[PDB]
């Protein structure tokens, strides 16, 4: 498995450098959280106004995320 993944990673990089040049809060939300880090900070501080649940809100954020 270690060798197989290395071969795939090597193949991925090899294919890279070719197409690129041609084309020239606590929960683990993911990379999208950076696009709403400030919003995610403000929502919690005023968590009394909002009424959704954190699980739903992440689902709502996931659904609306492009």
Partner 1 sequence: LREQILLNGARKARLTELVKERMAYQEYQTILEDLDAQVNAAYLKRTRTMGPGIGDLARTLMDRRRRWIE
Per-residue 3-state assignment (H helix, E strand, C coil) for the chain: CHHHHHHHHHHHHHHCCCHHHHCCCCCCCCHHHHHHHHHHHHHHHCCCCCCCCHHHHHHHHHHHCC
Is 38 a binding residue for partner 1 by CB under 8 A? The answer is: yes
Is 48 a binding residue for partner 1 by CB under 8 A? The answer is: no
Is 39 a binding residue for partner 1 by CB under 8 A? The answer is: yes
> 15 or 60, CB closer to partner 1?
60
Q: How far is CA 53 from the centre of its chain?
A: 20
Task: Find the part of the chain contacting partner 1 (CB under 8 A) among 9-17, 22-30, 40-48.
Answer: 40-48
Residue of 10, 41, 53, 62 interacting with partner 1 (CB under 8 A): 41
Is 36 a binding residue for partner 1 by CB under 8 A? The answer is: yes
């Amino acid at each position: 498995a270690m060798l197989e993944q290395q071969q795939l990673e090597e193949s991925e990089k090899q294919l890279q450098a070719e197409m690129d040049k041609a084309g020239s809060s606590s929960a683990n939300l993911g990379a999208s959280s950076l696009t709403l880090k400030h919003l995610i900070a403000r929502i919690d501080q005023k968590r009394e106004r909002v009424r959704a649940s954190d699980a739903e809100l992440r689902s709502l954020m996931n659904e609306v995320r492009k």
